């Protein structure tokens, strides 16, 4: 229920700490805590790239007119993403994008 | 606990059969390697 | 049960020259032989001897019409040259499950020319390099083997 | 002689084609999605 | 979900979003109760979102559960998870039952 | 027909037949475990061969010390570490006389290089033992931690930039009464995590300050930790060993006997030249014999004191400060303390229990509870054990740390060339562990007398020849460091081969690195043309599998393969397409040093050339040789935790879990409906609830009263 | 030699040696530099085949250096 969530948010806002953490921490920062909560670094670079390539958007992308020139979709295949990234502070692109 | 040192065993007759059979020519192959550029130098021809 | 009982059941107490096939299976034998088959037999086409504990081939009627013979699950290990002097008209040979040591045991089959298929399964001779090729060039008369000469046909 | 008939069975490898006997019909595949039904001939 | 559908709570009815015209493997139209059962089981995240949330059961052992089934606070309205053992189903009389 | 592979040796010389027996030049995974037991055995053996020396108590570290140098000479063929100083000095004198102006020039060059070097050079190394945390860490991290601790302790050597101030600050830090430093401490966790309860326990690290007394730091600096290297040394030792090894390398480079730092076919040239030289000057009618000697317990017998003597003799005419700088390393090694590692494990089968006994508590339990071998080892190690789970170890060399100086000592042993003016002359080669000895005499009897004299001489210098792994034969056929020489022919025993997979940088970079690795393998390890071509084929296969860039004309299917196929269909110059774009590979031996872009430039489609080499493409953005195009992309490298202080203080407040719980329901009801991009989570929640209320009212889930109530509250939020 | 070390991987090995020569802007004797090699190949094709005369003349008559028969250039 919208009303229940609204009242719960108001009750939480009554407390200062929750209000502060919600005001400052961003949605991007929300993902970070979960990562270290259940993720860490790996090794074996040869296999690392093998895993990375199979993912959706492993390749970093620059920001500019050329970056936006390539489309979001192509013949039912995604190429890049709209929302900004955290690490690269920009868009991320799929491997197929390069081929495009 | 004491270390379980490996036991001592005599000659196993199945290793000879393994070597004999694995060296035979079957009816199927499982190797498909990519191509290489054209060979020009004599060393490349010898290697090819 | 004994070879005699099997002979009586198959022949049903009739003349020996009335059946062209025999089934001597699961029959105990004296010191590993194939007794109960007298030399008076004149016509025979198919044979079947399995789990008979046959250790040697030294007792067999002389024949000129047999084309198939089946031996399996036996500890027989000896020269088979006697088959040429007993019945040089074999076409199907089955030694699956027998106990043969080396290639020399199958040498005496060269003098036989009518053999076209030979079977040797889980035999101590079968586990060797180029056993398939070595046997082929050792028995040129052979036209079939365990089943993969060039294709697959059925007996 | 015909077309894909799942009833006759799946596609037959060259091993079974070579050991086939005349007057018997089999099924083969040209490429993905274009199967065909063939029959051996004496000639 | 099943207790939700069985209770015939008005919220469960108001949480429907698709359509109810399903059948069985034999091809028969069922009563609306079982149609709703199948609809909600197929789409579990239909009545859960609009059901409404309730503060966690503040107590020594009583603790809440969220819509994702994780042992997370801010539970569903009414639902409670007690860290005790509930033993039920006494007097299995096997009373006389007829068959139509 | 029972195959017998060894029968090949009948038809082929064994030197060629056993070529490349081990595909791996590194370490296998099944090697005997190198744990606490192995290091205990190593220290036991090191002290066993030198137990006839002088045993005393160090007045600095308070540890047992054994000094075998100038000790009684051996009376048995067993390994001995008693190296007389006079023999070593005489051997160095002979080497210097034979090579006039060699020691002086090498020392001058080493000191000049040290003067011009920088602290950053220390970062080029394997795992280093960090003392602040007492573990194994990368070289850069260890150097940074040491620098930070020095700064905390009013030591700023790294600020000056030079290596000399850094080492001066190291030896000064060895004098501070109390040393303060940073360390990492892990504390358990209480933050939520969705498995079945929204609660998980883990470990979070924090930086703390810790102080240690003088003796503790002294012991820590000399400690050697264990991870065929057996142990690693911290940063306090790295600079001095670097300088000493540079000196030894300068000396060795001009020593014809030295087999280092030769690499490649130069090794074969040196081998053949040595054989030819020895045969040429053989006495008319004499006999030449060759020994493929091996050294047992090489690093368990060499003494750091003998290395100190060698360094002093070499730098006899040099500035006093440089002499001290060179001497600082041997003295540090002469006081090395070994760390025994993790410890042992003891179990109880009846109760199905097990536990780990760490090194400090090694003797905390009766010895009867250890198996026989461990019981005996602990009984023998008791005298050389410290209460802090460390073992004093004066002698030994724990594998390679003064390999160049070891080679210099071996060359000195080989340079005597005669004892008693008998009728034999010896020489040969040696590379830091193995020596090939050539002796020319009249008859084999005199050759063996000379071999015996050489054996005794090397015994006097502490070098122990392996009688159980050495043999002698007429010169012309022998071995030297896994390289069999036989009447001109030369073969390798173990050759490193390319490993599966790409280098792991990017398409063009990976291709270039693979090709250059193949080229280097051909040049150095001697890989034949056919083997190199097969390696190229395997690398291409692995590359295509990893990057999903199969041939454009292939029939494989993939997300990237559709675009590749379309490009292959639209392209005219199909020979010019890169392999990464499903094109044909054209690499071969003659063109293993040319980037594929340069190779295919002349055949590329001009439109394809423009697209590929576009000066401003969005992929490239901002050793090996390649071309900067659209295939030089960079992968996202951003992980771990930043904003550590703010995140830690937020997570330690209280209400974070409630915020996560409220976030989870709404933002997991849908797979992705988050207005991400630095949006405050409260703002995203406000927008999400606004949209949810709008949809509920539009579909009729809520009446107008609830609608207005929700907007009222949303109005109170601030984002509406 | 600076130009010889770069190709060393394809020149010298443990038990083999490849005779290789460098190049670089040696243009001017183009036609000649062509015919020779072409002619060489013809011999290489004829010596292996039986009766090299007719085959050699046949191949020589049916070869063109991109505009003209080999006979005119020779």
Curated annotation (Swiss-Prot), chain C:
Native source organism of the sequence: Homo sapiens
Ranges of the LRR repeats in the UniProt entry: 18-38, 43-64, 65-87, 89-110
Domain of life: Eukaryota
Subunit structure: Component of the SET complex, composed of at least ANP32A, APEX1, HMGB2, NME1, SET and TREX1. Directly interacts with SET. Interacts with ATXN1/SCA1. Interacts with MAP1B. Interacts with ELAVL1. Part of the INHAT (inhibitor of histone acetyltransferases) complex. Interacts with E4F1. (Microbial infection) Interacts (via C-terminus) with influenza virus A protein PB2; this interaction promotes viral replication.
Primary location group: nucleus
GO MF assignments: histone binding; RNA binding
Name this protein carries in UniProt: Acidic leucine-rich nuclear phosphoprotein 32 family member A
Tissue: Expressed in all tissues tested. Highly expressed in kidney and skeletal muscle, moderate levels of expression in brain, placenta and pancreas, and weakly expressed in lung. Found in all regions of the brain examined (amygdala, caudate nucleus, corpus callosum, hippocampus and thalamus), with highest levels in amygdala.
Keywords: Cytoplasm, Endoplasmic reticulum, Host-virus interaction, Leucine-rich repeat, Nucleus, Phosphoprotein, Repeat, Repressor, Transcription, Transcription regulation
The organism's taxonomic lineage, starting at the top: Eukaryota, Metazoa, Chordata, Craniata, Vertebrata
Any one annotated GO CC term: nucleus
GO biological process assignments: intracellular signal transduction; nucleocytoplasmic transport; regulation of apoptotic process
Domain LRRCT: 123-155
Described purpose of this protein according to its UniProt entry: Multifunctional protein that is involved in the regulation of many processes including tumor suppression, apoptosis, cell cycle progression or transcription. Promotes apoptosis by favouring the activation of caspase-9/CASP9 and allowing apoptosome formation. In addition, plays a role in the modulation of histone acetylation and transcription as part of the INHAT (inhibitor of histone acetyltransferases) complex. Inhibits the histone-acetyltranferase activity of EP300/CREBBP (CREB-binding protein) and EP300/CREBBP-associated factor by histone masking. (Microbial infection) Plays an essential role in influenza A, B and C viral genome replication. Mechanistically, mediates the assembly of the viral replicase asymmetric dimers composed of PB1, PB2 and PA via its N-terminal region. Also plays an essential role in foamy virus mRNA export from the nucleus.
Gene name of the record: ANP32A
Phosphoserine modifications at: 17
Localisation: Nucleus; Cytoplasm; Endoplasmic reticulum
Modified residues (Phosphothreonine): 15
Basic and acidic residues biased stretches: 147-155
Family that this chain belongs to: Belongs to the ANP32 family.
Post-translational modification: Phosphorylated on serine residues, at least in part by casein kinase 2/CK2. The N-terminus is blocked.
């Amino acid at each position: 229920m919208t009303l229940a969530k609204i009242e719960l948010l108001k009750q939480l806002l009554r407390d200062n700490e929750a209000k502060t953490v919600l005001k400052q921490t961003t949605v991007d920062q929300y993902n970070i805590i979960r990562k270290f909560n259940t993720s860490r670094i790996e090794k074996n670079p040869s296999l690392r790239m093998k895993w990375a390539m199979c993912s959706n958007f492993p390749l970093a992308l620059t920001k500019g007119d050329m970056a936006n020139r390539i489309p979001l979709e192509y013949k039912g295949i995604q190429l890049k993403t709209n929302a900004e990234d955290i690490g690269t502070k920009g868009q991320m692109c799929s491997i197929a994008a390069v081929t495009w | 606990e004491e270390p379980k040192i490996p036991n001592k065993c005599r000659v196993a007759a199945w290793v000879q059969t393994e070597m004999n059979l694995l060296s035979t020519l079957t009816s199927k192959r499982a190797l498909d390697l990519p191509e290489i550029g054209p060979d020009v130098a004599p060393v490349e021809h010898v290697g090819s | 049960m004994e070879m005699g009982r099997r002979i009586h059941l198959e022949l049903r107490n009739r003349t020996p020259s009335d059946v062209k096939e025999l089934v001597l299976d699961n029959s105990r034998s004296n010191e590993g032989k194939l007794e109960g088959l007298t030399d008076e037999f004149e016509e025979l086409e198919f044979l079947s001897t399995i789990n008979v504990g046959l250790t040697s081939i030294a007792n067999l009627p002389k024949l000129n019409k047999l084309k198939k013979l089946e031996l399996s699950d036996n500890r027989v290990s000896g020269g088979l040259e006697v088959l040429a002097e007993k019945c040089p008209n074999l076409t199907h040979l089955n030694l699956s499950g027998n106990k043969i040591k080396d290639l020399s045991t199958i040498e005496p089959l060269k003098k036989l020319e009518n053999l076209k298929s030979l079977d040797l399964f889980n035999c101590e001779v079968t586990n060797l390099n180029d056993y398939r090729e070595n046997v082929f060039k050792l028995l040129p008369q052979l036209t079939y083997l365990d089943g993969y000469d060039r294709d697959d046909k059925e007996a | 002689s015909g077309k894909y008939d799942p009833d006759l069975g799946d596609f037959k490898t060259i091993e079974e084609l070579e050991k086939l006997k005349p007057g018997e019909k089999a099924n083969i595949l040209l490429y993905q999605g274009k199967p065909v039904k063939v029959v051996k001939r004496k000639r | 979900i099943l207790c939700m559908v069985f209770s015939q709570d008005t919220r469960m009815f108001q949480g429907v979003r698709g359509e109810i015209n399903f059948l069985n493997r034999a091809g028969q139209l069922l009563s609306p109760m079982y149609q709703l059962q199948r609809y909600f089981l197929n789409r579990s995240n239909d009545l859960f979102d609009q059901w409404g949330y309730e503060e966690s059961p503040k107590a020594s052992e009583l603790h809440g559960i969220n819509e994702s089934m994780n042992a997370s606070d801010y539970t569903l309205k009414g639902v409670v998870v007690t860290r005790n053992v509930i033993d039920d189903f006494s007097s299995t009389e096997t009373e006389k039952v007829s068959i139509t | 027909m029972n195959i017998n592979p060894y029968f090949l040796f009948i038809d082929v010389p064994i030197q060629a037949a056993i070529s490349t027996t081990f595909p791996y030049t590194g370490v296998p995974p099944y090697s005997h475990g190198t744990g606490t037991g192995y290091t205990i055995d190593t220290v036991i053996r090191t002290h066993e061969y030198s137990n006839k020396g002088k045993q005393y108590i160090s007045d600095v570290t308070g540890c047992t010390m054994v000094d075998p140098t100038n000790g009684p000479l051996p009376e048995d063929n067993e390994p001995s570490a008693y190296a007389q100083l006079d023999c070593v000095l005489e051997a160095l004198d002979r080497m210097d006389e034979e090579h006039p102006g060699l020691f002086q020039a090498a020392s001058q060059n080493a000191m000049e290089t040290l003067m011009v070097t920088t602290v950053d050079k220390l970062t080029q190394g394997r795992q280093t033992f960090d003392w602040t945390v007492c573990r194994n860490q990368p070289a850069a991290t260890a150097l940074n931690t040491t620098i930070t601790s020095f700064r905390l302790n009013d030591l700023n050597g790294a600020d000056k930039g030079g290596l000399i101030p850094f080492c001066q600050d190291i030896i000064d830090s060895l004098d501070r009464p109390e040393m303060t430093f940073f360390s990492v401490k892990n504390i358990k966790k209480k933050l939520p995590a969705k498995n079945r309860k929204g609660f998980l326990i883990k470990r979070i690290p924090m930086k703390v300050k810790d102080k240690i007394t003088k003796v503790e730091y002294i012991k820590r600096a000399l400690s050697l930790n264990t991870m065929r290297a057996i142990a690693t040394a911290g940063i306090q030792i790295r600079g001095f060993v670097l300088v000493v090894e540079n000196l030894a390398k300068n000396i060795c480079e001009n020593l014809e006997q030295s087999g280092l730092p030769v690499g490649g076919n130069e090794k074969k040239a040196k081998l053949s030249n040595a054989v030819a030289k020895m045969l040429s000057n053989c006495p008319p009618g004499g006999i030449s014999m060759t020994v493929t000697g091996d050294n047992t317990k090489w690093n368990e017998c060499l003494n750091p004191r003998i290395f100190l003597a060698m360094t002093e003799r070499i730098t006899r005419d040099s500035p006093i400060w440089f002499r001290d700088f060179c001497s600082i390393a041997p003295v540090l090694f002469s006081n090395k303390i070994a760390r025994l590692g993790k410890g042992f494990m003891i179990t109880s089968k009846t109760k199905r229990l097990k536990a780990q006994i760490p090194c400090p508590d090694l003797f905390s339990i009766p010895l009867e509870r250890y198996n026989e071998e461990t019981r005996a080892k602990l009984k023998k190690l008791k005298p050389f054990f410290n209460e802090e789970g460390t073992a004093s170890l004066s002698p030994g060399m724990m594998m390679g740390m003064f390999n160049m100086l070891s080679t210099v000592l071996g060359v000195a042993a080989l340079g005597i060339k005669n004892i008693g003016n008998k009728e034999y002359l010896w020489d040969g080669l040696q590379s830091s562990d193995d020596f090939a000895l050539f002796v020319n005499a009249k008859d084999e009897e005199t050759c063996m007398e000379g071999i015996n004299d050489f054996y005794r001489t090397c015994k006097l210098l502490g070098i122990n020849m392996s009688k159980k792994k050495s043999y002698c034969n007429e010169t012309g056929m022998f071995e030297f460091t896994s390289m069999f020489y036989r009447d001109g022919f030369v073969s390798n025993f173990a050759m490193e081969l390319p490993s599966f997979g790409v280098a792991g940088v990017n398409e063009s970079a990976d291709m270039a690195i693979g090709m250059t690795i193949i080229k280097n393998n051909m040049i150095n390890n001697g890989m034949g043309p056919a083997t190199a071509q097969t390696a190229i084929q395997l690398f291409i296969a692995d590359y295509r599998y990893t990057y999903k860039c199969h041939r454009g004309d292939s029939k494989v299917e993939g997300k990237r393969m559709k675009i590749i196929k379309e490009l292959w269909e639209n392209t005219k110059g199909r020979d010019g397409l890169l392999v990464a774009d499903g094109g044909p590979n054209i690499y071969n031996l003659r063109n293993l040093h040319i980037p594929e872009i340069v190779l295919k430039y002349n055949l590329m489609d001009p439109e394809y050339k423009g697209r590929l080499l576009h000066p401003q493409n969005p992929f490239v953005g901002h050793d090996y040789d390649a071309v900067s195009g659209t295939h030089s992309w960079r992968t996202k490298r951003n992980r771990s935790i930043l904003n550590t202080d703010q995140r830690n203080m937020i997570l330690e407040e209280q209400c974070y879990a409630k915020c996560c719980n409220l976030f989870e329901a709404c933002f997991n009801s849908a797979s992705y409906r988050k207005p991400v991009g630095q949006h405050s989570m409260l703002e995203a929640m406000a927008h999400r609830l606004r949209m949810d209320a709008r949809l509920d009212y539009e579909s009729g889930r809520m009446s107008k009263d609830d609608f207005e109530k929700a907007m009222a509250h949303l109005g109170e939020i601030g984002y509406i | 030699s600076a130009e010889f070390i770069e190709m060393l991987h394809c020149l010298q090995g443990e038990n083999w040696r490849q005779i290789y020569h460098p190049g670089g802007n040696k243009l001017t004797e183009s036609r000649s530099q062509s015919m020779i090699v072409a002619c060489r190949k013809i011999i290489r094709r004829s010596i292996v085949a039986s009766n090299p005369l007719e085959l050699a003349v046949e191949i020589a008559n049916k070869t063109v250096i991109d505009t003209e028969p080999l006979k005119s250039c020779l």
